[PDB]
Amino acid sequence: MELRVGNKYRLGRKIGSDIYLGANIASGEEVAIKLECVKTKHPQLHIESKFYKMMQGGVGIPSIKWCGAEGDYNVMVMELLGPSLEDLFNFCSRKFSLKTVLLLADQMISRIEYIHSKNFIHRDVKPDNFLMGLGKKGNLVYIIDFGLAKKYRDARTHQHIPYRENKNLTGTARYASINTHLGIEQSRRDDLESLGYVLMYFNLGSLPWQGLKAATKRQKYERISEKKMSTPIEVLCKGYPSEFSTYLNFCRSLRFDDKPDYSYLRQLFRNLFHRQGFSYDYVFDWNMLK
Secondary structure (H helix, E strand, O other), X not given: OOOEEOOXXXXXXXXXXXXXXXXXXXXXXXXXXXXXXXXXXXXXXXXXXXXXXXXXXXXXXXXXXXXXXXXXXXXXXXXXXXXEHHHHHHHOOOOOOHHHHHHHHHHHHHHHHHHHOOOEEOOOOOHXXXXXXXXXXXXXXXXXXXXXXXXXXXXXXXOEOOOOOOOOOOOOOOOOOHHHHOOOOOOHHXXXXXXXXXXXXXXXXXXXXXXXXXXXXXXXXXXXXXXHHHOOHHHHOOOOOOXXXXXXXXXXXXXXXXXXXXXXXXXXXXXXXXXXOOOOOOOOHHHOOO
């Protein structure tokens, strides 16, 4: 007993949901480690490693440290990362200050942009899929889990994929864009609409269509769709800086194969940030006393 992997790493205690902690036999430096039985009836390790492998180089993308197999286990060793924004959100009693939301909004938009610049759309943007970094990168928002990512434009030609309908819901319902509820293929615009809901979710502690009484996954998704539909943005964002409405309105208007003006969007919020007098010092809410 006492399992090593890649001849450099020692397996450690479970640390998430399964991710294991691991260390470098020599330095003690810590890493994360996923394993997958070569006989799973639900592979995911490969795809995921392929993404980090492809997106390698991008900021906020977890770095792959080793890919291989050990016994009947497929093993991936990656840089260790911090808690997800949903965890830190709970740490802060499910409420983030404007300053925190804006610091997050800035990096989360760039993160999404990067993926789009690589021909894929995420399709499951939500607090759970964003993690802070460690040490030096502790002030960095990382994006993860590409289990639903999908190519939206030719590598070479940049030919966008076809517009198409009667598409099944494919991410979290709570954060899905209107169009996705309507069954339309997803494209860049939706990743950004979703962030828009994520952000308002942080502002409010919850979304009006959250916790909706249903009796069937089909029924539930229904109610959410109708509910999201009947909440106009100016109402949703009532009480908060209009920048947020300008944001969702913009996203909701992009044409299926449009290219979002990412800069417009960061700018939008960066201006609000400054008007309020905040400093880009990275003192997020979960960094302060409670």
